[PDB]
Amino acid sequence: QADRLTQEPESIRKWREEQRKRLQELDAASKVMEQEWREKAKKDLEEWNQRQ
């Protein structure tokens, strides 16, 4: 090529850092979704306890 590779290698890194701007959410999701829903399981659990 004669102009095809100066084109992207000063504008490709957009794709690079956005994939790492990816990351997060997903992993964040379950991590936090974990400590949460379980706190829920105790929510209902203490439900049982008092009420009885």
């Binding site: 102009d3 100066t6 084109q7 000063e10 504008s11």
Partner: protein
């Protein structure tokens, strides 16, 4: 004269009219580019796109205040500010921006000329 030299090449570019088919002046002048007379004559003549292309350094910031002012047929532009962003960071292609744009339906030809040569920022602004 168009092909004379350089020395008296600025003494007659001021007194060379005398009725003719100067239809070759602009053409030959366009074929033989020296920008110092494409005004002192073009301001007594006509042929513009063939002004914003032949020679570089462009006509400088000396061809816009009298260029996109009238507006012509699309093209010669897909070249100009295209060839600008990569080279000439004087930001001479933001003036020539809204400049060459001045259109009620363009902007399609305007996107293979502001990309391939690494643009953005200046484009997103």
């Amino acid at each position: 004269l168009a092909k004379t030299n350089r020395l008296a090449e600025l003494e007659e570019f001021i007194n060379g009219p005398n009725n003719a088919h100067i239809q070759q002046v602009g053409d030959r002048c366009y074929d033989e580019k020296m920008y110092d007379a494409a005004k002192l004559l073009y301001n007594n003549v006509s042929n513009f796109g063939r002004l914003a292309s032949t020679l570089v350094h462009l006509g400088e910031y000396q061809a816009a205040v009298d260029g996109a002012r009238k507006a012509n047929s699309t093209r010669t532009w897909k070249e100009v500010c295209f060839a600008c962003v990569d080279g000439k960071e004087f930001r001479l292609a933001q003036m020539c921006g809204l400049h060459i744009v001045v259109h009620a339906d363009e902007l399609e030809e305007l996107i293979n000329y502001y990309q391939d040569r690494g643009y953005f920022e200046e484009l997103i602004t």
